[PDB]
Amino acid sequence: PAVDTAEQVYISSLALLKMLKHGRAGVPMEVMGLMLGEFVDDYTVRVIDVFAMPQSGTGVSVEAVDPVFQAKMLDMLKQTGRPEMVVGWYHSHPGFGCWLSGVDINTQQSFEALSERAVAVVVDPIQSVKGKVVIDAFRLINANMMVLGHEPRQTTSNLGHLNKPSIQALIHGLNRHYYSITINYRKNELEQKMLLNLHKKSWMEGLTLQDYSEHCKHNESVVKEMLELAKNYNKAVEEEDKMTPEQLAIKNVGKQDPKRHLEEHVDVLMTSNIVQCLAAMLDTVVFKLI
Amino acid sequence: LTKQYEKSENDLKALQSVGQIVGEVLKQLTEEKFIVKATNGPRYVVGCRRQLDKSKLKPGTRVALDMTTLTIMRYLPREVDPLVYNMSHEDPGNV
Amino acid sequence: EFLHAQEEVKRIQSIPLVIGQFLEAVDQNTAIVGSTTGSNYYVRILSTIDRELLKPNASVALHKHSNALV
Amino acid sequence: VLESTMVCVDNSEYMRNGDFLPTRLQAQQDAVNIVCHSKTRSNPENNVGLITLANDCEVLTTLTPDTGRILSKLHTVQPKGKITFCTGIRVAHLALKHRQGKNHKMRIIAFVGSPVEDNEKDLVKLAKRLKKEKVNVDIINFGEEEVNTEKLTAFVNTLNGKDGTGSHLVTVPPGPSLADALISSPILA
Amino acid sequence: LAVQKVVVHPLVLLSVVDHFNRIGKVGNQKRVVGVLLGSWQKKVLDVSNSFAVPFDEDDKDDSVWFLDHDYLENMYGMFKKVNARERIVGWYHTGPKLHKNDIAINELMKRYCPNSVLVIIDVKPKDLGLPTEAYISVEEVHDDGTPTSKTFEHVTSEIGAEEAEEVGVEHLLRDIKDTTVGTLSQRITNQVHGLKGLNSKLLDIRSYLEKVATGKLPINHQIIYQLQDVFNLLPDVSLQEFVKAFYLKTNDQMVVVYLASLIRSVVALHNLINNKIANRDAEKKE
Ligand SMILES: [Zn+2]
């Protein structure tokens, strides 16, 4: 019964944010926690929620799992509608990629003895940027099976080889002592609409008019900036006429481009004045005494 | 001996710790970005621990950085040169 | 997706970054930088870097591994 | 048995009376100290929590496999306000629905030491609701049993229905200590 | 007051939505109540984490309600151990509006945090408003001689995210959030949302006044006092002084728009010049 390469680990929206928040706050400690969820089948591992284990002391490494903290947190989470078993553990790798070290391999073996399908999720809060989180799910490769000449997992699909392994992970034992499980994200309409409220400006701000004294001064200063930029823009036009195509860009390094700054000033000023004008016009009839 | 176990166990916890690179803060770029220079080495654009004060990290402050991430771990007092330490702790002879 | 690609290339700027000195721009995407480690490297420049700030003797943050100007 | 119990202690103004030596407040503290201790040895997993029956009910301590914390809370309980028995059982029943382990059985211990100022219809319908959730409330009719002997009679009879001694209505006449009659009552048996 | 603004992080919203879903799964619940954890910065609250607590209320009587405060203490020690800088800053409940017993629950919450802030997080995805409505308990000293009571005073709420929390949110909103719309279009959409938000607020007042007129609720005499100030503040845009000033200011911005558009067109002509030169040069060598 070899595990399938098409196995997927599903991380909920709540779970992903908790490890990112816990991992970032614990930078650079390899802060660990337990992933609650359910092994739906031989091909799916759902991570409904996670919770963070405390750090026993100083040291940038994964500490031993505290059994009293785990058991009495699991017991107390069951009271508020979370009767979900532990499907693995997560820990942070603050900036040096997502892989498993020697200590991480030993920690995973503790989970593998209890649950054979335990998943080691590594999250990189430092390398994670907006729209792309550096995450990976790992499960150990048994040395006895692979040494004798057996692949760690069967490949009955194309699903598990869509993500090219990183060289940093391949260096640190990927595909040698552990394998990567493809991570898919479970997002619903409800949670997705709720997250859309982030940075949603209040209705008061839309109709609020900017101070006209500062608006005119900003109008004043930026227009004065184009006065010098236009003077420099004229020089840039003549200079580029008599100037070789190898220096079309090299000569632009270290020297400001009047054309680029003129566009930015025009773009900034056009939205500043149009919005102020439209907001003033809307407020004229919306807030009327008659 | 019960005390022998405590000292032996203390060593095991002490073995898991890793040394930290000693540097010097040059300038704080952002709230979470710092420019530090190694004592004998290059200058790096590093981060800092959230739990740290970030107000005691004035430019020129000696700091300890993580070996891997180079994140600032703590701020240290001005280093006393061992030669200078031997200068102060030199016995005159009760003359 | 262009905005997503622009957003996702910023992970090359993740700390820690070794600090270099901009020496000479060979072309648009490549330049010579002097890392504080004491070695001069011919590396690439991230396309989302303001080339107007690449003045001579300008301190630049380089990738800790590839020394690229990020 | 593996059951979770809540003690509905009473701190009404009538708890200052010396009908029970030395004080009804002090007598009921010994009563809790014995009944709570009894539930501990019946099953080590048994859960005991404290709910005050003042003018407004206040859950001092929820269900816990601890005894000492119950008495420390009872030490700070001072006589104040009037009994509100209607809301006391429901607020105690609400905590029973949110117990540590759902395999535990419902059980509520009420210290009625002030008259229940409600109509018989409301008291009867409360018993039917507790019988729905298989909740057994054990009440000692000490204090003013001369006027509560009828309202509480409908309470236990409706809860116990026609079969099964789920709840008891043991009524101790005033004397040396109501706790001395508790060890002979079916509550502690 | 003691709080100037409450900042609710996206993690709290997801936790509250999940909390309502999991307990709501087993049994139909009017609302679910939890504890808000966060830090304090000047006078702006920074609600950043939350955990669920057992809670139940009888619908018939507001007085009967149970909150497992021993669970509340036990779970705090968990979160304090992991993150010591996150302290109890209030509670939350997912009920669409305030409840009568909320002032009673706050008193139980007040003993752990003296300036407790109740944030109502609506699980239902409202189209216009933010899902969070922060309140604080204050003593409303009436001038009519009625005794002072405990009332909830509204505190402005804002959804803000930590740098790492924002990173995960943009990952989850990667596909649906459309960032191609320019800044100018975004501000106009804000103005449309401002018009919709103001309209909804005005209908709420009109609905309240309609019920007052027909006797459904009595006259508050604080809303009516407030309403007279609202209509008195309505400016007269037909004054000659304001119209001349509006015309004078509008023309001041128009010339700047005209100057920017004038610069834009010729810069566009320069780009067309370069394109035709590049096209002509490319075809000459080929
Ligand atoms: Zn690790």
Task: Please give, one letter per residue, the 3-state secondary structure of chain D.
Answer: CCEEEEEEECCCHHHHCCCCCCCHHHHHHHHHHHHHHHHHHHCCCCEEEEEECCCCCEEEEEEECCCHHHHHHHHCCCCCCCCCHHHHHHHHHHHHHCCCCCCCEEEEEEEECCCCCCCHHHHHHHHHHHHHCCCCEEEEECCCHHHHCCHHHHHHHHHHCCCCCCCCCCCCCCCCCHHHHCCCCCCCC
Q: Are strands C40-44 and D47-52 parallel, antiparallel or unpaired?
A: unpaired
Cβ neighbours around D5 below 10 Å, total:
25
* Radius of gyration, CA atoms only, chain A: 28
Non-local (6+) Cβ contacts of E124 within 8 A are: E96
The DSSP bridge partners found for residue E90 are E36, E117
The DSSP bridge partners found for residue C18 are B44, C62
- Given a contact cutoff of 8 angstroms between Cβ atoms, the answer to whether D111 and D140 are in contact is yes
| Contact: A271, E187; criterion CB under 8 Å | yes
Alpha helix locations (H) across B1-95?
2-15, 82-88
DSSP state of B69: T
Chain C partners of B73 at a C-beta cutoff of 8 Å?
none
Handedness of CA C2, C7, C10, C12 (dihedral sign): negative
Residue D124 main-chain phi, psi, to 5 deg: -65, -45
* Long-range pairs of E97-100 with CB within 8 A, sequence gap ≥ 24: E98/E135, E98/E152, E99/E31, E99/E57, E99/E62, E100/E62
Q: Which residues of A91-130 are buried (b: 16+ CB within 10 A; e: fewer)?
A: bbbbbbbbbbbeebbebbeebbeeeeebbbbbbbbbbbbb
Instruction: Determine the distance from the C-alpha atom of residue B67 to the mean position of all C-alpha atoms in its chain, rounded to a whole number.
Output: 11
Distance CA A31, CA A60 (A): 8
Domain count, chain D: 1
Residue B65 main-chain phi, psi, to 5 deg: -110, 145
Per-residue tokens: A155 = 């490949």
A37 interface with E at CB cutoff 8 Å? no
Window E:118-137, CB contacts with D under 8 Å: none
Distance CA E269, CA E279 (A): 15
Chain C partners of B24 at a C-beta cutoff of 8 Å?
none
Could you tell me the distance, in angstroms and rounded to a whole number, from the CA of residue A90 to the centre of ligand 1? 9
Q: Which amino acid is at E52?
A: A
- Given a contact cutoff of 8 angstroms between Cβ atoms, the answer to whether B44 and C35 are in contact is no
Per-residue tokens: A192 = 């997705």
Could you tell me the distance, in angstroms and rounded to a whole number, from the CA of residue A30 to the centre of ligand 1? 6
Tokens 């409840």 correspond to E99
Distance CA A134, CA A91 (A): 13
Q: Which of B43, B47, B69 is nearest residue C36 as measured by Cβ atoms?
A: B43
| Contact: C51, A129; criterion CB under 8 Å | no
Residue A17 main-chain phi, psi, to 5 deg: -70, -35
Non-local (6+) Cβ contacts of A247 within 8 A are: none
- Given a contact cutoff of 8 angstroms between Cβ atoms, the answer to whether E132 and E95 are in contact is no
Whole-angstrom distance between the N-terminal and C-terminal Cα of chain C? Answer: 21
Search chain D and give the residue with CA nearest E23. D98
Search chain A and give the residue with CA nearest D99. A79
| Contact: B45, C36; criterion CB under 8 Å | no
Could you tell me the distance, in angstroms and rounded to a whole number, from the CA of residue A98 to the centre of ligand 1? 8
Residue B37 main-chain phi, psi, to 5 deg: -120, 135
Could you tell me the distance, in angstroms and rounded to a whole number, from the CA of residue A152 to the centre of ligand 1? 22
Residue A271 main-chain phi, psi, to 5 deg: -75, -30
Q: Name the helix (H) or strand (E) containing E274.
A: helix E240-285
Chain E partners of D62 at a C-beta cutoff of 8 Å?
68-71
Non-local (6+) Cβ contacts of E243 within 8 A are: E237
Non-local (6+) Cβ contacts of E20 within 8 A are: E29, E31, E32, E94, E123
Search chain D and give the residue with CA nearest A79. D100
Cβ neighbours around A78 below 10 Å, total:
14
Instruction: Determine the distance from the C-alpha atom of residue E29 to the mean position of all C-alpha atoms in its chain, rounded to a whole number.
Output: 24
Non-local (6+) Cβ contacts of E121 within 8 A are: E8, E12, E13, E16, E17, E92, E93, E94, E131, E132
How is chain E split into domains, by residue range?
A: 3-183, 224-283
Q: Is E10 strand, coil or helix?
A: helix
Search chain C and give the residue with CA nearest B45. C17
Q: At what angle do helices E223-232 and E183-213 cross, to 10 degrees?
A: 130
CA distance A122 to chain E (A): 15
Per-residue tokens: D104 = 């535990």
Q: Which amino acid is at E70?
A: D
E-contacting chains (≥3 CB pairs under 8 Å): A, C, D
Chain A partners of E181 at a C-beta cutoff of 8 Å?
none
- Given a contact cutoff of 8 angstroms between Cβ atoms, the answer to whether E23 and E178 are in contact is no
B87 backbone φψ class: left, alpha, beta (φ>0; ψ -120 to 50): alpha
| Contact: C4, E180; criterion CB under 8 Å | no
Instruction: Give the torsion through C-alpha atoms of B59, B63, B65, B70, to 10 deg.
Output: 0
Q: What are the angstrom distances between the C-alpha of A17 and each of A174, A199, A279, D73, E89?
A: 25, 17, 37, 40, 21
A213 interface with B at CB cutoff 8 Å? no
As annotated, the binding site of A includes 91, 93, 104
Distance CA B41, CA D2 (A): 68
Non-local (6+) Cβ contacts of A5 within 8 A are: A153, A154, A155, A156, A157, A159, A160, A161
Distance CA E71, CA A194 (A): 28
Residue A284 main-chain phi, psi, to 5 deg: -65, -40
- Given a contact cutoff of 8 angstroms between Cβ atoms, the answer to whether B63 and B28 are in contact is no
Q: Which of E49, E182, E191 is nearest residue A282 as measured by Cβ atoms?
A: E191
Per-residue tokens: A247 = 């220096």
* Long-range pairs of E140-144 with CB within 8 A, sequence gap ≥ 24: E144/E221
Could you tell me the distance, in angstroms and rounded to a whole number, from the CA of residue D44 to the centre of ligand 1? 41
Chains B and A touch (3+ CB pairs under 8 A): yes
Per-residue tokens: E118 = 């109740």
Tokens 């752990």 correspond to E112
Non-local (6+) Cβ contacts of A188 within 8 A are: A13
Cβ neighbours around D1 below 10 Å, total:
9
* Among E49, B48, E10, E171, residue whose Cα is nearest residue A24: B48
E162 interface with D at CB cutoff 8 Å? no
Per-residue tokens: B23 = 């540097």
Cβ neighbours around B90 below 10 Å, total:
8
Distance CA A241, CA E270 (A): 12
Judge residue E107's burial from the number of C-beta atoms within 10 Å of its C-beta, 0-12 exposed, 13-18 middle, 19 or more buried. exposed
D72 interface with E at CB cutoff 8 Å? no
Q: Is C68 strand, coil or helix?
A: coil
Distance CA E15, CA E51 (A): 8
Distance CA D83, CA D142 (A): 14
CB-side exposure of D22: number of CA atoms within 13 Å? 1
Per-residue tokens: A64 = 């031993």
- Given a contact cutoff of 8 angstroms between Cβ atoms, the answer to whether B45 and C15 are in contact is yes
CA distance D94 to chain A (A): 14
C3 interface with E at CB cutoff 8 Å? yes
Could you tell me the distance, in angstroms and rounded to a whole number, from the CA of residue A22 to the centre of ligand 1? 14
Could you tell me the distance, in angstroms and rounded to a whole number, from the CA of residue E266 to the centre of ligand 1? 57
Distance CA E71, CA E52 (A): 9
Q: What is the DSSP string of E12-65?
A: HHHHHHHHHHHHHHHS--S--EEEEEEEEETTEEEEEEEEE--EEE-SS-SS-E
DSSP state of E222: S
Chain B partners of C19 at a C-beta cutoff of 8 Å?
35, 42-45
The DSSP bridge partners found for residue A133 are none
- Given a contact cutoff of 8 angstroms between Cβ atoms, the answer to whether D167 and D159 are in contact is yes
Distance CA A215, CA A192 (A): 37
Tokens 């020697």 correspond to A102
Search chain E and give the residue with CA nearest D91. E64
Distance CA D11, CA D14 (A): 8
Q: Which amino acid is at E19?
A: H
| Contact: C51, A253; criterion CB under 8 Å | yes
C28 interface with A at CB cutoff 8 Å? yes
* Among D69, A27, E43, D51, residue whose Cα is nearest residue B47: A27
* Radius of gyration, CA atoms only, chain E: 27
- Angle at CA of residue B46, ends B42 and B50, nearest 5°: 150
- Given a contact cutoff of 8 angstroms between Cβ atoms, the answer to whether B54 and B48 are in contact is yes
A79 interface with D at CB cutoff 8 Å? yes
CA distance E101 to chain D (A): 12
Tokens 């019964």 correspond to A1
Non-local (6+) Cβ contacts of E196 within 8 A are: A203, E128
| Contact: C54, A253; criterion CB under 8 Å | yes
| Contact: E180, C3; criterion CB under 8 Å | yes
Window C:4-33, CB contacts with E under 8 Å: 4, 7
Cβ neighbours around C54 below 10 Å, total:
20
Q: Determined by which method?
A: cryo-EM
Check whether the bond before D176 is cis (ω within 30° of 0): no
Q: Which residues of E168-205 are buried (b: 16+ CB within 10 A; e: fewer)?
A: bbbbbbbeebebeeeeeeebbebbebbeebbeeeeeee
Instruction: Give the torsion through C-alpha atoms of E151, E153, E158, E161, to 10 deg.
Output: -50
Per-residue tokens: D60 = 């001092």
- Helix, strand, coil percentages, rounded to 5, for chain E: 50, 20, 30
- Mutate: best of D89, D94, D100, partner E, most E CBs <10 A: D94
Q: Which of C27, C52, C58 is nearest residue A255 as measured by Cβ atoms?
A: C52
CA distance D93 to chain E (A): 9
CA distance E173 to chain C (A): 11
B70 backbone φψ class: left, alpha, beta (φ>0; ψ -120 to 50): left
B-contacting chains (≥3 CB pairs under 8 Å): A, C
* Among D55, D89, D90, D50, residue whose Cα is nearest residue D66: D50
Tokens 């009719």 correspond to D141
Chain A partners of B16 at a C-beta cutoff of 8 Å?
59, 61
- Given a contact cutoff of 8 angstroms between Cβ atoms, the answer to whether D151 and D121 are in contact is no
Distance CA E101, CA D91 (A): 14
The full 3-state SS of chain A, as one line of letters, equals: CCCECCCEEEEEHHHHHHHHHHHHHCCCCCCEEEEEEECCCCCEEEEEEEEECCCCCCCCCCCCCCHHHHHHHHHHHHHHCCCCEEEEEEEECCCCCCCCCHHHHHHHHHHHHHCCCCEEEEEEEEEEECCEEEEEEEEECCHHHHHCCCCCCECCCCHHHCCCCCHHHHHCCECCCEEEEEEEEECCHHHHHHHCCCCCCCHHHHHCCCCHHHHHHHHHHHHHHHHHHHHHHHHHHHHHHCCCCCHHHHCCCCCCCHHHHHHHHHHHHHHHHHHHHHHHHHHHHHCCCC
Distance CA A117, CA A98 (A): 19
Per-residue tokens: A104 = 């991480």
The DSSP bridge partners found for residue A123 are A92, A135
Chain E partners of A80 at a C-beta cutoff of 8 Å?
19, 22-23, 51-54
Could you tell me the distance, in angstroms and rounded to a whole number, from the CA of residue A137 to the centre of ligand 1? 12
Residue E57 main-chain phi, psi, to 5 deg: -140, 135
Distance CA E18, CA A195 (A): 13
CA distance D102 to chain A (A): 10
Q: Which amino acid is at A182?
A: T
Alpha helix locations (H) across E53-125?
69-82, 102-110
* Among D51, D4, D32, D130, residue whose Cα is nearest residue E70: D51
As annotated, the binding site of A for Zn(2+) includes 91, 93, 104
